[PDB]
PDB file of all heavy atoms in Angstrom:
ATOM      1  N   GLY R   1      -2.750  -0.381   8.946  1.00 36.73           N
ATOM      2  CA  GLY R   1      -1.794  -0.166  10.045  1.00 36.73           C
ATOM      3  C   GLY R   1      -0.387   0.202   9.613  1.00 36.73           C
ATOM      4  O   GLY R   1       0.551  -0.267  10.135  1.00 36.73           O
ATOM      5  N   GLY R   2      -0.321   1.122   8.550  1.00 36.54           N
ATOM      6  CA  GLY R   2       0.992   1.498   8.095  1.00 36.54           C
ATOM      7  C   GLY R   2       1.006   3.031   8.053  1.00 36.54           C
ATOM      8  O   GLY R   2       0.026   3.661   8.023  1.00 36.54           O
ATOM      9  N   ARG R   3       2.264   3.544   8.058  1.00 39.19           N
ATOM     10  CA  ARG R   3       2.488   4.961   8.011  1.00 39.19           C
ATOM     11  C   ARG R   3       2.547   5.498   6.637  1.00 39.19           C
ATOM     12  O   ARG R   3       2.922   4.803   5.654  1.00 39.19           O
ATOM     13  CB  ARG R   3       3.756   5.305   8.803  1.00 39.19           C
ATOM     14  CG  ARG R   3       3.882   4.707  10.204  1.00 39.19           C
ATOM     15  CD  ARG R   3       2.619   4.844  11.027  1.00 39.19           C
ATOM     16  NE  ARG R   3       2.203   6.252  11.202  1.00 39.19           N
ATOM     17  CZ  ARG R   3       1.326   6.617  12.116  1.00 39.19           C
ATOM     18  NH1 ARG R   3       0.760   5.812  12.950  1.00 39.19           N
ATOM     19  NH2 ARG R   3       1.059   7.951  12.169  1.00 39.19           N
ATOM     20  N   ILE R   4       2.286   6.811   6.499  1.00 37.56           N
ATOM     21  CA  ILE R   4       2.387   7.486   5.225  1.00 37.56           C
ATOM     22  C   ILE R   4       3.785   8.075   5.140  1.00 37.56           C
ATOM     23  O   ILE R   4       4.207   8.904   5.970  1.00 37.56           O
ATOM     24  CB  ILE R   4       1.279   8.575   5.040  1.00 37.56           C
ATOM     25  CG1 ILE R   4      -0.105   8.043   5.354  1.00 37.56           C
ATOM     26  CG2 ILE R   4       1.291   9.145   3.661  1.00 37.56           C
ATOM     27  CD1 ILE R   4      -1.204   9.029   5.252  1.00 37.56           C
ATOM     28  N   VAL R   5       4.517   7.694   4.091  1.00 38.80           N
ATOM     29  CA  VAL R   5       5.923   8.041   3.941  1.00 38.80           C
ATOM     30  C   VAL R   5       6.062   9.102   2.886  1.00 38.80           C
ATOM     31  O   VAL R   5       5.522   8.902   1.760  1.00 38.80           O
ATOM     32  CB  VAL R   5       6.753   6.775   3.613  1.00 38.80           C
ATOM     33  CG1 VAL R   5       8.269   7.135   3.683  1.00 38.80           C
ATOM     34  CG2 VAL R   5       6.464   5.667   4.556  1.00 38.80           C
ATOM     35  N   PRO R   6       6.781  10.231   3.152  1.00 39.64           N
ATOM     36  CA  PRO R   6       6.814  11.335   2.138  1.00 39.64           C
ATOM     37  C   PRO R   6       7.880  11.167   1.147  1.00 39.64           C
ATOM     38  O   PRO R   6       7.872  11.858   0.089  1.00 39.64           O
ATOM     39  CB  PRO R   6       6.987  12.552   3.046  1.00 39.64           C
ATOM     40  CG  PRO R   6       7.736  12.093   4.237  1.00 39.64           C
ATOM     41  CD  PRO R   6       7.345  10.600   4.436  1.00 39.64           C
ATOM     42  N   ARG R   7       8.889  10.335   1.378  1.00 39.58           N
ATOM     43  CA  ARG R   7       9.894  10.092   0.397  1.00 39.58           C
ATOM     44  C   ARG R   7      10.597   8.739   0.665  1.00 39.58           C
ATOM     45  O   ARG R   7      10.487   8.174   1.697  1.00 39.58           O
ATOM     46  CB  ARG R   7      10.952  11.273   0.430  1.00 39.58           C
ATOM     47  CG  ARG R   7      11.419  11.608   1.807  1.00 39.58           C
ATOM     48  CD  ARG R   7      12.432  12.757   1.743  1.00 39.58           C
ATOM     49  NE  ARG R   7      13.007  13.030   3.016  1.00 39.58           N
ATOM     50  CZ  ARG R   7      14.141  13.669   3.169  1.00 39.58           C
ATOM     51  NH1 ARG R   7      14.841  14.149   2.232  1.00 39.58           N
ATOM     52  NH2 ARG R   7      14.625  13.901   4.462  1.00 39.58           N
ATOM     53  N   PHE R   8      11.247   8.269  -0.393  1.00 36.66           N
ATOM     54  CA  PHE R   8      11.776   6.910  -0.379  1.00 36.66           C
ATOM     55  C   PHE R   8      12.824   6.700   0.685  1.00 36.66           C
ATOM     56  O   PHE R   8      12.913   5.698   1.346  1.00 36.66           O
ATOM     57  CB  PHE R   8      12.332   6.542  -1.725  1.00 36.66           C
ATOM     58  CG  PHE R   8      11.443   6.904  -2.863  1.00 36.66           C
ATOM     59  CD1 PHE R   8      11.699   8.040  -3.628  1.00 36.66           C
ATOM     60  CD2 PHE R   8      10.415   6.132  -3.232  1.00 36.66           C
ATOM     61  CE1 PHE R   8      10.870   8.406  -4.626  1.00 36.66           C
ATOM     62  CE2 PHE R   8       9.562   6.460  -4.279  1.00 36.66           C
ATOM     63  CZ  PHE R   8       9.819   7.637  -4.991  1.00 36.66           C
ATOM     64  N   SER R   9      13.650   7.749   0.951  1.00 37.30           N
ATOM     65  CA  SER R   9      14.761   7.637   1.917  1.00 37.30           C
ATOM     66  C   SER R   9      14.253   7.403   3.307  1.00 37.30           C
ATOM     67  O   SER R   9      15.045   6.877   4.101  1.00 37.30           O
ATOM     68  CB  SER R   9      15.613   8.878   1.831  1.00 37.30           C
ATOM     69  OG  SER R   9      14.910  10.113   2.073  1.00 37.30           O
ATOM     70  N   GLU R  10      13.043   7.745   3.614  1.00 39.36           N
ATOM     71  CA  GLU R  10      12.456   7.519   4.927  1.00 39.36           C
ATOM     72  C   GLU R  10      11.704   6.205   5.028  1.00 39.36           C
ATOM     73  O   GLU R  10      11.192   5.835   6.122  1.00 39.36           O
ATOM     74  CB  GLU R  10      11.487   8.651   5.228  1.00 39.36           C
ATOM     75  CG  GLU R  10      12.102  10.008   5.100  1.00 39.36           C
ATOM     76  CD  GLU R  10      11.173  11.078   5.566  1.00 39.36           C
ATOM     77  OE1 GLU R  10      10.441  10.870   6.543  1.00 39.36           O
ATOM     78  OE2 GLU R  10      11.162  12.228   4.920  1.00 39.36           O
ATOM     79  N   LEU R  11      11.586   5.413   3.934  1.00 37.70           N
ATOM     80  CA  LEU R  11      10.840   4.194   3.920  1.00 37.70           C
ATOM     81  C   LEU R  11      11.623   3.123   4.727  1.00 37.70           C
ATOM     82  O   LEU R  11      12.813   2.970   4.594  1.00 37.70           O
ATOM     83  CB  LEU R  11      10.659   3.691   2.505  1.00 37.70           C
ATOM     84  CG  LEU R  11       9.616   2.609   2.304  1.00 37.70           C
ATOM     85  CD1 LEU R  11       8.262   2.962   2.912  1.00 37.70           C
ATOM     86  CD2 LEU R  11       9.452   2.304   0.831  1.00 37.70           C
ATOM     87  N   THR R  12      10.865   2.467   5.656  1.00 36.96           N
ATOM     88  CA  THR R  12      11.454   1.416   6.476  1.00 36.96           C
ATOM     89  C   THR R  12      10.400   0.225   6.474  1.00 36.96           C
ATOM     90  O   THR R  12       9.259   0.344   6.090  1.00 36.96           O
ATOM     91  CB  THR R  12      11.732   1.876   7.819  1.00 36.96           C
ATOM     92  OG1 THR R  12      10.663   2.557   8.430  1.00 36.96           O
ATOM     93  CG2 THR R  12      12.989   2.862   7.881  1.00 36.96           C
ATOM     94  N   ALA R  13      10.844  -0.893   7.046  1.00 39.54           N
ATOM     95  CA  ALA R  13       9.984  -2.049   7.198  1.00 39.54           C
ATOM     96  C   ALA R  13       8.852  -1.774   8.221  1.00 39.54           C
ATOM     97  O   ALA R  13       7.731  -2.328   7.988  1.00 39.54           O
ATOM     98  CB  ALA R  13      10.784  -3.235   7.578  1.00 39.54           C
ATOM     99  N   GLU R  14       9.166  -1.045   9.272  1.00 36.91           N
ATOM    100  CA  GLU R  14       8.196  -0.794  10.251  1.00 36.91           C
ATOM    101  C   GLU R  14       7.079   0.107   9.820  1.00 36.91           C
ATOM    102  O   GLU R  14       5.943   0.144  10.467  1.00 36.91           O
ATOM    103  CB  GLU R  14       8.817  -0.211  11.551  1.00 36.91           C
ATOM    104  CG  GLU R  14       9.559  -1.246  12.352  1.00 36.91           C
ATOM    105  CD  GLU R  14      10.901  -1.521  11.773  1.00 36.91           C
ATOM    106  OE1 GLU R  14      11.371  -0.772  10.871  1.00 36.91           O
ATOM    107  OE2 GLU R  14      11.605  -2.524  12.220  1.00 36.91           O
ATOM    108  N   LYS R  15       7.305   0.910   8.798  1.00 36.73           N
ATOM    109  CA  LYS R  15       6.244   1.814   8.209  1.00 36.73           C
ATOM    110  C   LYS R  15       5.332   1.159   7.203  1.00 36.73           C
ATOM    111  O   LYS R  15       4.385   1.792   6.675  1.00 36.73           O
ATOM    112  CB  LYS R  15       6.902   3.030   7.652  1.00 36.73           C
ATOM    113  CG  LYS R  15       7.693   3.913   8.583  1.00 36.73           C
ATOM    114  CD  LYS R  15       8.151   5.110   7.932  1.00 36.73           C
ATOM    115  CE  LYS R  15       8.850   6.097   8.940  1.00 36.73           C
ATOM    116  NZ  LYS R  15       9.285   7.365   8.364  1.00 36.73           N
ATOM    117  N   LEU R  16       5.602  -0.167   6.861  1.00 37.55           N
ATOM    118  CA  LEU R  16       4.774  -0.817   5.903  1.00 37.55           C
ATOM    119  C   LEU R  16       3.430  -1.265   6.534  1.00 37.55           C
ATOM    120  O   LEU R  16       3.456  -1.778   7.599  1.00 37.55           O
ATOM    121  CB  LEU R  16       5.528  -2.021   5.369  1.00 37.55           C
ATOM    122  CG  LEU R  16       6.840  -1.812   4.588  1.00 37.55           C
ATOM    123  CD1 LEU R  16       7.463  -3.137   4.240  1.00 37.55           C
ATOM    124  CD2 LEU R  16       6.575  -0.999   3.417  1.00 37.55           C
ATOM    125  N   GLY R  17       2.342  -1.125   5.775  1.00 40.25           N
ATOM    126  CA  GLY R  17       1.085  -1.695   6.185  1.00 40.25           C
ATOM    127  C   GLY R  17       0.958  -3.115   5.811  1.00 40.25           C
ATOM    128  O   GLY R  17       1.789  -3.667   5.089  1.00 40.25           O
ATOM    129  N   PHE R  18      -0.113  -3.718   6.283  1.00 40.62           N
ATOM    130  CA  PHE R  18      -0.381  -5.136   5.972  1.00 40.62           C
ATOM    131  C   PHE R  18      -1.779  -5.307   5.533  1.00 40.62           C
ATOM    132  O   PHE R  18      -2.696  -4.735   6.108  1.00 40.62           O
ATOM    133  CB  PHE R  18      -0.099  -6.028   7.166  1.00 40.62           C
ATOM    134  CG  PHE R  18      -0.233  -7.473   6.895  1.00 40.62           C
ATOM    135  CD1 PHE R  18       0.767  -8.143   6.310  1.00 40.62           C
ATOM    136  CD2 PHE R  18      -1.386  -8.157   7.266  1.00 40.62           C
ATOM    137  CE1 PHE R  18       0.684  -9.505   6.011  1.00 40.62           C
ATOM    138  CE2 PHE R  18      -1.517  -9.514   6.934  1.00 40.62           C
ATOM    139  CZ  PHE R  18      -0.468 -10.131   6.385  1.00 40.62           C
ATOM    140  N   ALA R  19      -2.023  -6.117   4.505  1.00 38.66           N
ATOM    141  CA  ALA R  19      -3.336  -6.526   4.044  1.00 38.66           C
ATOM    142  C   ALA R  19      -3.283  -7.976   3.634  1.00 38.66           C
ATOM    143  O   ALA R  19      -2.326  -8.423   2.934  1.00 38.66           O
ATOM    144  CB  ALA R  19      -3.779  -5.592   2.814  1.00 38.66           C
ATOM    145  N   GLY R  20      -4.277  -8.716   4.075  1.00 38.67           N
ATOM    146  CA  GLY R  20      -4.409 -10.157   3.764  1.00 38.67           C
ATOM    147  C   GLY R  20      -4.692 -10.433   2.240  1.00 38.67           C
ATOM    148  O   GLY R  20      -4.375 -11.525   1.823  1.00 38.67           O
ATOM    149  N   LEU R  21      -5.294  -9.521   1.581  1.00 38.99           N
ATOM    150  CA  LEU R  21      -5.658  -9.745   0.202  1.00 38.99           C
ATOM    151  C   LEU R  21      -5.856  -8.351  -0.475  1.00 38.99           C
ATOM    152  O   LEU R  21      -6.627  -7.588   0.039  1.00 38.99           O
ATOM    153  CB  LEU R  21      -6.853 -10.602   0.033  1.00 38.99           C
ATOM    154  CG  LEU R  21      -7.459 -10.671  -1.283  1.00 38.99           C
ATOM    155  CD1 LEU R  21      -6.575 -11.399  -2.277  1.00 38.99           C
ATOM    156  CD2 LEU R  21      -8.834 -11.325  -1.284  1.00 38.99           C
ATOM    157  N   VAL R  22      -5.133  -8.109  -1.549  1.00 38.93           N
ATOM    158  CA  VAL R  22      -5.334  -6.923  -2.426  1.00 38.93           C
ATOM    159  C   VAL R  22      -5.710  -7.469  -3.828  1.00 38.93           C
ATOM    160  O   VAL R  22      -4.965  -8.228  -4.426  1.00 38.93           O
ATOM    161  CB  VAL R  22      -4.129  -6.012  -2.468  1.00 38.93           C
ATOM    162  CG1 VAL R  22      -4.429  -4.774  -3.355  1.00 38.93           C
ATOM    163  CG2 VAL R  22      -3.696  -5.613  -1.122  1.00 38.93           C
ATOM    164  N   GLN R  23      -6.864  -7.122  -4.312  1.00 37.13           N
ATOM    165  CA  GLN R  23      -7.385  -7.679  -5.574  1.00 37.13           C
ATOM    166  C   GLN R  23      -7.977  -6.590  -6.437  1.00 37.13           C
ATOM    167  O   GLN R  23      -8.367  -5.551  -5.974  1.00 37.13           O
ATOM    168  CB  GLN R  23      -8.542  -8.712  -5.237  1.00 37.13           C
ATOM    169  CG  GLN R  23      -8.582  -9.813  -6.288  1.00 37.13           C
ATOM    170  CD  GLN R  23      -9.462 -10.930  -5.800  1.00 37.13           C
ATOM    171  OE1 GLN R  23     -10.165 -10.888  -4.808  1.00 37.13           O
ATOM    172  NE2 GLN R  23      -9.363 -12.107  -6.514  1.00 37.13           N
ATOM    173  N   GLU R  24      -7.934  -6.894  -7.710  1.00 37.44           N
ATOM    174  CA  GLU R  24      -8.548  -6.029  -8.762  1.00 37.44           C
ATOM    175  C   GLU R  24      -9.889  -6.657  -9.216  1.00 37.44           C
ATOM    176  O   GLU R  24      -9.867  -7.824  -9.557  1.00 37.44           O
ATOM    177  CB  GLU R  24      -7.615  -5.773  -9.954  1.00 37.44           C
ATOM    178  CG  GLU R  24      -8.207  -4.952 -11.026  1.00 37.44           C
ATOM    179  CD  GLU R  24      -7.153  -4.536 -12.071  1.00 37.44           C
ATOM    180  OE1 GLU R  24      -5.958  -4.562 -11.711  1.00 37.44           O
ATOM    181  OE2 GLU R  24      -7.473  -4.214 -13.191  1.00 37.44           O
ATOM    182  N   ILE R  25     -10.947  -5.882  -9.144  1.00 40.29           N
ATOM    183  CA  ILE R  25     -12.309  -6.388  -9.360  1.00 40.29           C
ATOM    184  C   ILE R  25     -12.854  -5.857 -10.644  1.00 40.29           C
ATOM    185  O   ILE R  25     -12.838  -4.678 -10.866  1.00 40.29           O
ATOM    186  CB  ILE R  25     -13.214  -5.983  -8.143  1.00 40.29           C
ATOM    187  CG1 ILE R  25     -12.712  -6.654  -6.865  1.00 40.29           C
ATOM    188  CG2 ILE R  25     -14.668  -6.338  -8.445  1.00 40.29           C
ATOM    189  CD1 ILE R  25     -12.748  -8.139  -6.866  1.00 40.29           C
ATOM    190  N   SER R  26     -13.385  -6.786 -11.454  1.00 40.05           N
ATOM    191  CA  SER R  26     -14.085  -6.485 -12.667  1.00 40.05           C
ATOM    192  C   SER R  26     -15.566  -6.435 -12.459  1.00 40.05           C
ATOM    193  O   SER R  26     -16.054  -6.960 -11.464  1.00 40.05           O
ATOM    194  CB  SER R  26     -13.789  -7.487 -13.782  1.00 40.05           C
ATOM    195  OG  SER R  26     -12.338  -7.601 -13.972  1.00 40.05           O
ATOM    196  N   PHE R  27     -16.288  -5.767 -13.323  1.00 39.57           N
ATOM    197  CA  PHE R  27     -17.707  -5.470 -13.210  1.00 39.57           C
ATOM    198  C   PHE R  27     -18.456  -5.831 -14.429  1.00 39.57           C
ATOM    199  O   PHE R  27     -19.246  -5.028 -14.969  1.00 39.57           O
ATOM    200  CB  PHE R  27     -17.928  -4.071 -12.763  1.00 39.57           C
ATOM    201  CG  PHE R  27     -17.477  -3.765 -11.350  1.00 39.57           C
ATOM    202  CD1 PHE R  27     -16.303  -2.994 -11.221  1.00 39.57           C
ATOM    203  CD2 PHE R  27     -18.120  -4.215 -10.272  1.00 39.57           C
ATOM    204  CE1 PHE R  27     -15.848  -2.746  -9.898  1.00 39.57           C
ATOM    205  CE2 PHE R  27     -17.696  -3.921  -8.951  1.00 39.57           C
ATOM    206  CZ  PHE R  27     -16.585  -3.198  -8.785  1.00 39.57           C
ATOM    207  N   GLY R  28     -18.254  -7.018 -14.966  1.00 41.97           N
ATOM    208  CA  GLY R  28     -18.918  -7.492 -16.167  1.00 41.97           C
ATOM    209  C   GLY R  28     -18.379  -6.942 -17.432  1.00 41.97           C
ATOM    210  O   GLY R  28     -17.152  -6.876 -17.578  1.00 41.97           O
ATOM    211  N   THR R  29     -19.253  -6.568 -18.348  1.00 41.90           N
ATOM    212  CA  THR R  29     -18.870  -5.973 -19.638  1.00 41.90           C
ATOM    213  C   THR R  29     -18.740  -4.498 -19.611  1.00 41.90           C
ATOM    214  O   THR R  29     -19.449  -3.748 -20.332  1.00 41.90           O
ATOM    215  CB  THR R  29     -19.755  -6.492 -20.711  1.00 41.90           C
ATOM    216  OG1 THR R  29     -20.942  -5.667 -20.755  1.00 41.90           O
ATOM    217  CG2 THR R  29     -20.212  -7.960 -20.479  1.00 41.90           C
ATOM    218  N   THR R  30     -17.872  -3.984 -18.694  1.00 40.91           N
ATOM    219  CA  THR R  30     -17.826  -2.566 -18.426  1.00 40.91           C
ATOM    220  C   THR R  30     -16.431  -1.893 -18.589  1.00 40.91           C
ATOM    221  O   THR R  30     -16.484  -0.657 -18.641  1.00 40.91           O
ATOM    222  CB  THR R  30     -18.475  -2.211 -17.083  1.00 40.91           C
ATOM    223  OG1 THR R  30     -18.791  -0.793 -17.015  1.00 40.91           O
ATOM    224  CG2 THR R  30     -17.463  -2.522 -16.014  1.00 40.91           C
TER     225      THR R  30
END
């Protein structure tokens, strides 16, 4: 639910998305 921002000067709090959990997943010995 966030907007795609083309440059930093246009970044605002209302354009930020939300996610309850962002994680990095490993896959064994790979």
Side-chain angles (χ1 to χ4, degrees):
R3 309 315 300 199
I4 310 179
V5 188
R7 44 181 189 162
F8 315 98
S9 58
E10 310 186 34
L11 195 53
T12 50
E14 285 80 11
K15 298 186 174 182
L16 298 175
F18 185 82
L21 169 66
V22 183
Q23 209 166 13
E24 177 167 337
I25 294 300
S26 307
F27 292 106
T29 81
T30 197

